[PDB]
Structure formats: structure tokens, C-alpha cells
Amino acid sequence: STGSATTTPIDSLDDAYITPVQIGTPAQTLNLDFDTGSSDLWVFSSETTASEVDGQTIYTPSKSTTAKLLSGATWSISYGDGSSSSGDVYTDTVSVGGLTVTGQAVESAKKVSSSFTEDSTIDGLLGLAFSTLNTVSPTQQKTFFDNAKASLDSPVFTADLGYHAPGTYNFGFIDTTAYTGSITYTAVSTKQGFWEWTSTGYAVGSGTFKSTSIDGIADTGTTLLYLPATVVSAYWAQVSGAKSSSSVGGYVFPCSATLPSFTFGVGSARIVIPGDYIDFGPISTGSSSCFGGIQSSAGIGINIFGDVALKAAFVVFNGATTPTLGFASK
Ligand SMILES: NCc1ccc(C(F)(F)F)cc1
Numbered sequence: 001s002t003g004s005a006t007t008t009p010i011d012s013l014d015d016a017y018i019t020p021v022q023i024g025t026p027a028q029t030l031n032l033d034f035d036t037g038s039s040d041l042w043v044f045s046s047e048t049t050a051s052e053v054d055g056q057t058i059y060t061p062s063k064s065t066t067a068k069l070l071s072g073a074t075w076s077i078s079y080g081d082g083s084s085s086s087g088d089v090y091t092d093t094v095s096v097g098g099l100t101v102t103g104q105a106v107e108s109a110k111k112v113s114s115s116f117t118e119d120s121t122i123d124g125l126l127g128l129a130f131s132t133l134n135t136v137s138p139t140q141q142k143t144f145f146d147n148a149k150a151s152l153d154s155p156v157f158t159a160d161l162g163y164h165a166p167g168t169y170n171f172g173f174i175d176t177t178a179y180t181g182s183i184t185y186t187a188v189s190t191k192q193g194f195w196e197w198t199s200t201g202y203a204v205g206s207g208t209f210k211s212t213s214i215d216g217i218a219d220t221g222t223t224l225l226y227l228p229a230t231v232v233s234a235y236w237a238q239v240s241g242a243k244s245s246s247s248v249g250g251y252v253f254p255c256s257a258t259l260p261s262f263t264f265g266v267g268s269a270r271i272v273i274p275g276d277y278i279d280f281g282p283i284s285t286g287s288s289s290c291f292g293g294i295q296s297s298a299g300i301g302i303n304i305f306g307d308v309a310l311k312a313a314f315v316v317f318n319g320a321t322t323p324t325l326g327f328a329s330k
């Protein structure tokens with residue numbers, strides 16, 4: 001079997017992408033944030049503290065004839081940005097673009113952090129990292145991808161994120177019409193539960209390519225590109241007037257500047273991020289200081305190839321017994 005679903009940016013800056021997901025019988029359609037950096041499928045629900053819901057579409061298990069409460073199971077998650085949520089667990093039927101999984105763990109939020117409440121466009125998250133990171137206790141649960149793997153034509157999914165435009169998540173097949181040239185595959189380490197890989201280096205604009213190993217994770221659930229301080233300093237040094245601002249919390253630049261592209265290596269291949277992808281607009285309404293899309297990972301502890309990098313490529317998440325990541329230009 002296969003599945004295909006359109007994913008849409010939630011705002012004018014591509015801060016996140018939402019994809020419609022059908023849950024329950026009859027279907028309840030929720031717009032979920034597909035997150036290859038986490039492994040919980042959790043949703044706003046009829047059980048969520050009422051004051052913590054502000055416009056989200058909620059999952060109502062009591063209206064689904066296929067929902068079963070997973071007795072005694074709870075979940076609690078904290079994301080690298082400080083957001084968090086927790087609740088109890090149902091199993092139900094979950095469908096993504098024609099691909100159906102029965103008995104999927106659907107984690108019902110009882111409590112969500114403020115950043116989720118204020119995001120009226122995101123009804124929940126669909127985790128696509130490895131199931132070892134799932135937070136359900138006392139019995140760990142599998143991700144949607146792990147549950148679907150056996151019935152998929154090929155144990156893969158692909159991310160084709162758009163720049164200020166819709167894109168596509170495909171499950172079980174590779175669309176050879178969606179990219180140019182060849183796909184370059186690179187080894188993945190699952191030892192931390194992430195889609196973790198090693199980039200072979202970088203270039204700033206038309207500068208010389210620097211061969212150097214950068215270990216990081218492919219994370220559709222993170223907006224920006226977080227790289228080591230040496231690399232990030234080399235990039236912003238090429239933008240007149242750019243500086244790291246402690247009050248803002250990262251590199252800012254004059255909104256009148258033109259940004260250079262950023263190239264990152266995948267084996268012997270190169271993915272080029274156009275400079276416009278790195279502009280995240282004014283730091284406050286009406287400001288002439290703009291926020292940069294490439295930031296330092298020094299405070300994080302791991303390098304993150306977030307949406308800024310991934311949307312410049314066609315990305316294959318190969319969940320074979322030896323997992324790999326594939327990157328192609330598009
Ligand atoms: N998108 C999920 C996510 C968020 C943060 C991290 C961090 F910070 F731990 F790297 C990993 C994965």
C-alpha cells in the first residue's frame with residue numbers, strides 16, 4: 001500500500017507545516033504537524049483543559065466507534081524548545097492520504113503548554129522519529145510509520161516541503177518526477193532515536209566548499225537550521241550589518257540586505273539553500289531588523305537540519321533494516 005498527503009505552511013514564514021490526518025470512525029480530520037524529530041502522535045482532544053484550547057480542532061474519542069482507551073497508559077513529552085504536553089492514550093484507526101493503520105496509539109492531550117495553545121493552526125503532532133523515543137508509559141507505543149511499514153510497498157516516506165507553498169508527504173513509494181538528478185543516500189545512526197546523519201561540509205554563497213563533518217538530525221518539526229558556531233559565524237560574516245543579538249536570541253540582519261545562499265554536503269553531492277529561504281522577516285512588526293534562518297546550535301547540544309534546509313531538497317527517509325537518508329535537488 002501507499003499514501004500521499006499535501007502539507008501546507010501554517011503562515012507566511014513557513015514556521016511549520018500541517019497535513020490533514022483522519023482519525024476514528026467516522027473520520028475526524030485534524031491538521032497535524034509531521035515531526036521527524038519526535039515519536040508521539042498526540043492531539044488536542046475533548047479531554048484537553050478547556051482554557052488551553054484556542055481554536056484548535058479537537059479529537060473526540062467518545063464519538064469514534066473504533067476508539068479504545070489504553071488502560072493505565074499515560075504520556076508526557078518535552079520538546080527542545082521548552083514546549084510540553086501530556087495526557088492519556090487511546091487506540092484508533094488513523095489514515096494519512098489513503099494509507100490506513102488500525103490500532104494506532106492516539107495520545108490525548110489533557111494538558112498542553114502555552115506555545116501550543118497560541119498556535120490555532122496545529123491540532124497536534126505526528127511523530128516520525130524512531131519508536132524508541134515514544135513517551136507512552138508503562139508500555140511504549142509504535143509510531144504511525146512503524147505500524148504501517150509492513151504493508152507499505154517500500155519501507156520509506158519522503159518529505160517534499162514547499163517554500164511559501166504546499167508540498168507533499170509520500171508513504172511507501174518514491175516519486176521520481178519530484179526531484180532532479182539523482183538521490184544521494186547517506187548513513188543514519190539510530191542510537192539517539194533520531195534520523196541522525198553526517199553532512200560532509202558547507203559553503204557560503206559562491207565561496208569555496210569547506211570539507212568538514214557535521215553530525216546532525218533531519219527534523220521536519222524544527223523551523224530553522226541550527227549549526228555549530230564556527231559555521232554560523234562564517235555565514236553571517238558575509239552579510240553587512242548582521243550581528244548576534246542576545247536580547248533577540250540569535251543572529252539578526254538589516255532587512256534591506258540580500259542574503260547569500262548556503263550549501264551543505266551530502267556525501268559527494270551538494271544541496272543549495274537559496275538566500276531568500278534564510279530570511280524570517282522583521283523581529284517585531286514594523287522593525288527594520290530581520291531574523292536569520294541559520295542560528296547557532298551551541299546552546300542546544302545537537303545540530304538540527306530543520307525546515308530551512310529540508311525544504312531545499314527532496315528527502316527520503318528510508319526505514320529499511322539498515323536505515324538511510326536520501327537527498328536530491330529539486
Ligand atoms: N522536532 C522535535 C525535536 C525538538 C528538539 C530536539 C532537540 F532540541 F533535542 F534537538 C529534537 C527533536
Ligand SMILES: NCc1ccc(C(F)(F)F)cc1
Pocket residue numbers: 016033035037038079080081083115116119122221222
Ligand atoms: N519540534 C516540535 C515542535 C513543533 C511545534 C511546536 C510549536 F510551534 F507548537 F511550539 C513546538 C515543538
